[PDB]
Amino acid sequence: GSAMDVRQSIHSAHAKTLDTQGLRNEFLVEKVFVADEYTMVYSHIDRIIVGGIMPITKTVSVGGEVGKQLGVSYFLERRELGVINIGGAGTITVDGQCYEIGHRDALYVGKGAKEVVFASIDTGTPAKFYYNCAPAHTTYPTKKVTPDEVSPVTLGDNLTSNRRTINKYFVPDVLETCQLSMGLTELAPGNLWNTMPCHTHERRMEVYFYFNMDDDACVFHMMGQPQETRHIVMHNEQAVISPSWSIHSGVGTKAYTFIWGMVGENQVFDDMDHVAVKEIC
Amino acid sequence: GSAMDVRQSIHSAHAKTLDTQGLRNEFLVEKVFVADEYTMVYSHIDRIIVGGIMPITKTVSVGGEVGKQLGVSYFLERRELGVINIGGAGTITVDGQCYEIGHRDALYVGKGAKEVVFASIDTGTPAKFYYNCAPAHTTYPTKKVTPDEVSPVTLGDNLTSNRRTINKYFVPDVLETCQLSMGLTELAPGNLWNTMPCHTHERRMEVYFYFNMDDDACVFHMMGQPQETRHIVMHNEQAVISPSWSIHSGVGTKAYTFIWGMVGENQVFDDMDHVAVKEIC
Amino acid sequence: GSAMDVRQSIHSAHAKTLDTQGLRNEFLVEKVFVADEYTMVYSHIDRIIVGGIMPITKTVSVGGEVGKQLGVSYFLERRELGVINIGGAGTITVDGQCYEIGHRDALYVGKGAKEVVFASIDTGTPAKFYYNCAPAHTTYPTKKVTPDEVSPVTLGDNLTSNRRTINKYFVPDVLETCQLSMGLTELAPGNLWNTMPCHTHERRMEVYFYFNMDDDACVFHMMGQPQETRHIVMHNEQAVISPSWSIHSGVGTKAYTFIWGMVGENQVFDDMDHVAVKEIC
């Protein structure tokens, strides 16, 4: 069926020997949005599935076929889905129930949903549905989350180039999920740093997706163990997978927006090892 | 805090470069049963936790402290436990509820159980509780499983040295679990091969535990991708971790018994890639 | 002239870094029997030459041409030859003297024989002459050895899966040779292990040839230093070269038969380092 980009899990000792292209081949997802298609990358790190869906002349659906590829009857038979629309207004129909998902609206689809259909309202400005999918043992209600219900928080300062607005869509304070959490953080114009100071967490893993970047800009995404850092240079609408032993911080050449997705054996966000940047240098 | 042996996940390209000791350091658990203590190995491959508990002069408990090591309040706050006793009669008390677990009896403890205490009835023939623990999002009832509740099946033939009795303890036909399944297979005297022909399954992983072996015997456990196989020579009461891209088949120098534990994103046991041994050679 | 597959000698430190294919390229002889042809593999480990001859529509001979390839006048000008027929009845003619070599009959040809011609009696069930050839400084009588003159010995036990019958064809008790010894060992149905416990011998080297195996079976041939073992998966009618620092033991998925050939600076079979399997694990 549809092509499935599979990434293996990786040992820190192996990762530290990878050259530039080697790092990209393992951790970088270069193509997230493809017209009238959905992309799908399967990571053996917590078995999270990441991708993008951009419906233009036709709808794009996931269900039976994808499920068979996963050894089950349908895609979400034993999985939960988190979707955030960074493009134009669209709709997501779950087993017949249509949800209007506008710019920056989001939708969490619980375990048990048989078919999910994505569509764009205007072909001129198509919806760009970014998603993260994780194994789920229990069914929680499918829920639409708007920027309102999120209650954004602006932190940082120009001097530390981290003035930004944090929007947490899928977290305990908003709704119940099995293990998936997602949020969107927008750096203010002229501000470049995200996740600083950095951190690592043995019991959870994160995937970052960068977007809303000018064609001539990029983000130097920092990864690796604190004392053995490496970087991947990324451009607009690309995602990066972070092993549990790795940090995940980035600095752009211009301001940008990014989405973070996190899974693991717990949802204790303070269960992490904070790393002061001075320790790195 | 109690020592926690942590094993990282590993890429097939990395594993194929490991020498004999390297393979042992990564995949082999050399000591499972330690008097009056519990052993615990954490594998980043599906975050399964495995070990053994052998109470002799005192009971051994797991609960609050172990939970703190996992960033939670107690061991099973977000996990399920599967235990099989291969030693003498003992008991397992879950939050005050005492279960009599004799030789070859087993106990599944669901998510939410706060403290589990293991004990042996006779210090001369201590219980040997082998356990596998996996993340769980749903709470299923704690349940004792005995041999007469399991439907034993004899398969194989002497000519193929695989005459054996299969005993599936934690499987869909017996009880509901989130992702864990476990069983015990005993080879008839003079029969050496397990999991032959072999297989691999991208969506699940298994851990094998070998026991009931003479002091002068061993098992050559075959692992690796089908076309890049390797082996680890193991002795009595040792376990081996198998990545999803790896096979897991062993041949002893004498008959033996082993327990398999499996976790992953589905419990579709037929969702695998069968590998005819003739393909390997 | 005829193609000659040459294998170099190898250092233990080099061998331990070889991957699956690397091990096969160095030590495995994949094609031993080819219709109306003879195969010839030259190993710089004691300069032993191994191969197979399967005459069907024509006879196959070795003599002048092969000798020139070795820098001499004829193949056995400074070499001795040991041949064992594992196929249908045939004949081996040495400088005009015809020897009837039936199934499991053997022939030792001493230094000085100028031409050796191999033939099959029935094209439907051709002779399969397996041979080992070694440098020889003195001429010993050409001698036909039948399964009678061998006096077989049955050892082992089903429990250790090594019940087998040992047939030593070319050994001091049967005839005089310069340095070559050969024998045939047949495992009883349902028995899998050969050369266990294993051993190594600095002053001699062995070559194993596996046959009489079902098309769906294989043998996991164990090699390498005792504490750094590796394996080569082999199928019907394939041979494997063992360096002096390496062990040579194998376990099949079904019973099989194999021939061993040994050369070196002495024929003291007890001059070896025995290795208890428990030492390996």
Add this chain to the structure above:
Amino acid sequence: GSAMDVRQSIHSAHAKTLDTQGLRNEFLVEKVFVADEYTMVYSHIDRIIVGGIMPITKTVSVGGEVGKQLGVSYFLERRELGVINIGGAGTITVDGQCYEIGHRDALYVGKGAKEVVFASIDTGTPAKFYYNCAPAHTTYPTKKVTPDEVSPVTLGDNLTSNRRTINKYFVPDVLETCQLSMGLTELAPGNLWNTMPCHTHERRMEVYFYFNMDDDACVFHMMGQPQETRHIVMHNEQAVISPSWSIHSGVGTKAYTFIWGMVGENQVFDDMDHVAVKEIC
């Protein structure tokens, strides 16, 4: 003799295999200013010598002894020196001629000067003389360069986090030198990027020195071939050597100031390969 830290030249194929510590060992100068001493690093890349001098309780001189270490009679017998004071007011006496070098004043010492003595006016706020020294075949006049003699130019913008003031001290428009050029660039508060977009120049090499940074800040200095970039995390008052095949661009966690030094076979600053950041990603 005074300790001389010697760095070899390096091939791009070699540099791309270096791990974090390896990169630091080769290209990073971790200690530049040491009380009452001078530091000295010799790079086989164009044989440039770099270091710092911080006189506190006594003067620090360079002359005869250093010359002997270079196989000549005195330090500047065949070399030219460029010094920039980033500390408190001080003086530099060249063969008896005393020059008052205040904060941000600089001094170029031409070939032929026998002894140079560095001093600080106030021990409470010692002068911090950063210097770059290169081979010189011609004698140009020793010359003091002050800020009002330099033509400061403000470039960049907050949106691209590169708002900065460029101060070129030793350049063709100011004075004549054999091959050395040096300048000081100060990023405005909240601006982090230097040398963006980046470049490479086969015929020249540069050394960057970062300072005026808070104790809790650092600079991720980007290096390497454009398609094989690496980074070195540096802290206050540390320098980095850049091979001709490498880029040199840094981004801080906070604003900072840095000095660049450049040598080579020409002083054609436009003789370089411009690299658009979009090419890297």
Add this chain to the structure above:
Amino acid sequence: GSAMDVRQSIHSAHAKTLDTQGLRNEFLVEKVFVADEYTMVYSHIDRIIVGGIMPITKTVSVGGEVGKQLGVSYFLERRELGVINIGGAGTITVDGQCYEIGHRDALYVGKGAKEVVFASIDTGTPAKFYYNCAPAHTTYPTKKVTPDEVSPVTLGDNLTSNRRTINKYFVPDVLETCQLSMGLTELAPGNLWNTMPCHTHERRMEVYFYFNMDDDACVFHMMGQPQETRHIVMHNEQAVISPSWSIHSGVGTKAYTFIWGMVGENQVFDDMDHVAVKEIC
């Protein structure tokens, strides 16, 4: 424009891992003389440029175009040139001034010369102009040097196979140059060794060019650190680049002649580390 063979600088730790071809690719210049063309090899080790010019049917000139390749207006705008003719009589015209350069005559061209034109008097026995070019900050007079003005010295002894005649063309005793020195040494018939005992010099580098060798002869050129020597097998009219950490000595299979060129930060020829051959063995 004209092809430019660029060689990077190299670290001793990198060089010691290079195989035979790797050493040749880095240090050997296989083609020095090409009919009606000039060859040009640029080494990042002191930025010396080496090559050969053999005019036959047309003159060969260097000037504007080559200069542009170096980022300047003309080849010698910031460089000095040393040329030695090992072929038939020719002429070298510098900015209109014609110099007659016969067999073994030489010409030093100082910084500032805009165009240099090479020509041969007889096409049957063309001039073979070998040159070395180095960065130069000051202009010294262009000067023709004949074998007379050189005052040759014959040293060595047949017993040590180093009987030879040394001819130093460009050295302080003959003329002033910025950093370049060159000479020609001819081994007597039957004498094979050059530069023995060997040496190294951190502050200078040398390039050796071997010629006047029979078609069936070669020179085993020894290089590398004294305790980690390697060799490059060379034939008639080939040059070899030597890093500052490397020795440069050679032994032929027959007598030969060679030219040495040296550049660096000083012209103190006794500033070196002598190495007794007994130290090497």
Add this chain to the structure above:
Amino acid sequence: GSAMDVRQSIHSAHAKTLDTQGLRNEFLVEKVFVADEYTMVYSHIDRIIVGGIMPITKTVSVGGEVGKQLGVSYFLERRELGVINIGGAGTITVDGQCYEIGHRDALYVGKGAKEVVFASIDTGTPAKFYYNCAPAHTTYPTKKVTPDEVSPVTLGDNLTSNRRTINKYFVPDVLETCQLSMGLTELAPGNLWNTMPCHTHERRMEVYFYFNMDDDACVFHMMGQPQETRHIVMHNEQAVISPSWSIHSGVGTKAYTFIWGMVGENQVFDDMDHVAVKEIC
């Protein structure tokens, strides 16, 4: 038991990765003559044993104990010995039979000799017995070989620095041996090259022993495949082992003498691959 220096056989792909010390560890025998002792090196390349014996205050014998180390009853039970005395007059007693072996006299001891005792006539000028020992299947008569029994041949020329006198002691024209041949070649003063042009022979191997060299001299012994040559720098009285795939040619810094020993499956000295030195370069 007496120390036995054992060298493994080696693959060309392995040998080409060895650094200077690695090559020495594998192929070089640094100490051959030790006062009142015998040295012994065992090479798995044809199982040749080499060493030296220098009796000063007492005799040195080889027999029973050494045999036990080889798994036999006595040293020469299945081996032949070739000895050449390069020191002062001495004697060699074989099972009671005393042979007077003066300077440059030699002795071949055939298979079956039980004990060999070496002695020196004058302690002031001790005998220096260099020996090569190889497996032997046939018993040939023990025989003393003197210079006047050898047919010396002078070859080479000063122009090719290979003027030398060849003395073949153990060869077909002198006596019968199983596989061993040995000779002594002395270069005339001022001549440095041996075995030039070089060669390789798949069916035989050689060991070279250099001596009569001044304390300030050495020999650059060339080895390796023709297109992947390496060298080992040796001093007085040191030996070097050459794999069948390797060349063996040396060039001294002064004249010297050397002994070659050769074994293999044939004694056809013309059965080799001639390599023109021009092929190497």
